Amino acid sequence: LIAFDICGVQPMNSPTGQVFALRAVYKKFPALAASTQTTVGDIYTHFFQETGTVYLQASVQVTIDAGATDAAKLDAEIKKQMEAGALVEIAEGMATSIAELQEGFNGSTDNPWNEMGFRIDKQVIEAKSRQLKAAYSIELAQDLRAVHGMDADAELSGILATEIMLEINREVVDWINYSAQVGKSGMTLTPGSKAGVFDFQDPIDIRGARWAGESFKALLFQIDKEAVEIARQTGRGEGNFIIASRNVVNVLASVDTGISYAAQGLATGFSTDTTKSVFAGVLGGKYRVYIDQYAKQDYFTVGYKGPNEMDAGIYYAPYVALTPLRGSDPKNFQPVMGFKTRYGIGINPFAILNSLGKNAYFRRVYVKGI
Amino acid sequence: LIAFDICGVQPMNSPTGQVFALRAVYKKFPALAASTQTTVGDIYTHFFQETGTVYLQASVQVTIDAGATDAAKLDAEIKKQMEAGALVEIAEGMATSIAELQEGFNGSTDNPWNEMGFRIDKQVIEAKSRQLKAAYSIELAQDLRAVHGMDADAELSGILATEIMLEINREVVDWINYSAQVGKSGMTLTPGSKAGVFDFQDPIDIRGARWAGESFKALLFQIDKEAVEIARQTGRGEGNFIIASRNVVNVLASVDTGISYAAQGLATGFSTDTTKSVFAGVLGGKYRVYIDQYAKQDYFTVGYKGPNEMDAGIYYAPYVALTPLRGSDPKNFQPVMGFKTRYGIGINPFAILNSLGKNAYFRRVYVKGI
Amino acid sequence: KKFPALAASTQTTVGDIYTHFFQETGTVYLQASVQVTIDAGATDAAKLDAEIKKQMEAGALVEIAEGMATSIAELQEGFNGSTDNPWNEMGFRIDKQVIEA
Predict the structure, then answer these.
(1) Which string of DSSP letters, residue by residue, matches A256-269?
(2) Which residues of B touch A10 (CB under 8 A)?
(3) Is A266 part of the contact surface with chain B (CB cutoff 8 Å)?
């Protein structure tokens, strides 16, 4: 039990109630043109008639066809010079490099200090409750005691307590899958991809892989791609843990030999304790990985978690847990037991209106084809 | 954290300020023809109607069909002799052999007491300063202490120190990737490719590699090609390290075991320490590799670093570091923390503006297809 | 402080404050006590004034002037509470004079 290994806890000693989080704050190149005599290392921006522009670095001090007054002719000369390696391209890189040039030369004593670009802020949380009832009967309880000498209600209580703990852990996962951003999107797309869904039977998603062996590894590859996007947006780091369906976990477990575990002492001893509430292990040796036992379809979500409870992107503050209830239902006089909790949750706002599909600490991907 | 692993330092005792760098200095084989009997070990030139010319070494003293007055027939006889192993084709392996022959043969002591390929020189290093301001609210600090017993400002300081360290090493990398020459060019560019970019989905770049598995290895190969170009131009040997985006590093990490840590300690201990500040590992057992945590888009750079600080290709000479700031601003009476540094940087001359796209110690390539 | 104008057809809502400049005797700031539509056919300022006045007579609309400007200022400032840099001074200068005996 306990899903909080992957969220800030920041337990409250009162409801209502608050948590803290490490929220981050958040080029006029010469055009390449006919007759331009390039200079090695310099970058020119060329507009092709098709597909916009490119940024080209001269490796060769070459004049680009002075008679090419026809953009089409110029485009052809450029393509040839590019094929020849005379002109080469790193688009976003070059934009950065010229900015560095400009800023370096434009430096001035002034007062050019920069801020420690983190809002570092707080949110208010109500210790929202959850609860369950035993909904059991005397014929059962009477017989459990009469037949096995069983403590009857005590077991029903143990089941019920387990169930509420599992249900809250499920809720933690549901919130992650609520607030997580759509993965396999934007920066994490393969140009020929299906936008947000990983299909193990699809040559693009599996990157041409053969059999299950490589298709399974290809999923792990997409997972690393997602982990990076988390790092990029959060400014905190690569996703550190994964929540995924039984199908996905079993798939991932088939690779890297010793990443996910069965808690194999279990099978060895003939089901000594199934502990179906725990982390499988560490995926790739890098991601703490847990099974979403209630996965609705089939999926995985990659998330980040630092040692600092303010560095989770999601929080759970267990003010109250397992408070028992006792009574009966006069409609049939059947006995009543139950358990309630109070905790309060929240996320890094990044602006639950601002939570849905917006939380930079998590990327959610739909899985098909297993 | 520091990125000194790949820089010369020669720390300053005064600003402006200077460091030293190892500024570098900066054949008609007789034609094979119809009726000619070859001499074993000798080499002849032959231009085939298709393919063109190669140098052919005789293993057999064979007359090449005196009746082959038809170039097509002559090519055919030669082809047969090649199949026979009588004539074996090589291009530069032979061009050098003839140059060596000629140099030996017409050699004379003369007076070639030429200089080593060096000049050695020095640059003036301005201890450019950088300042980071915590810019935090007192209310936050009060609540962190009041709510969780947190040290607040002390912790904000830890963030601050970390951020300035990150900014400094980030800057070092930005200059590397400004002075680096664009790779996947010249000697390292296949004529049919994309000039400056390695696309993992492109059969030319991936050398026909099957799926992501082999495509990933194909990049590793391109890295060796870039490493060699560095050796060719610098004369100090091949690239020794890699600076690369999180996508590239994760890709490289998928092969050959020792490429990177998995940050397994983090996951193993339940989110203890992400340690995202040090070299990932060694690519192929050859290139010391580290993540550019601020990569703008996706790219990698291969670079050389000698044990002699003067052989780094880039210099960082810390003068002042992590000097703390304490103060406040009465207009809102907010407390102030911050840090100053002074260091100064430089690049092997290769003759800001004087380093852009010129530095042979590094080769930068844009990445697509991950 | 830029109260919404009261106008024909407007359904005023209780507690909300509207501004209305009458053809005669300047303006008022009216707080709805009753949710009500101000004669949608009153496109004639003369009619609109008559309707607003009628609603005022009805007790539907009640005026206070600076008292409401103060409340809306609080509304706005409260919602916009932040650090500009804003600290306010103790509202005193405290000074001295030289006097001969």
Answers:
(1) SSSSB---THHHHT
(2) 148
(3) no
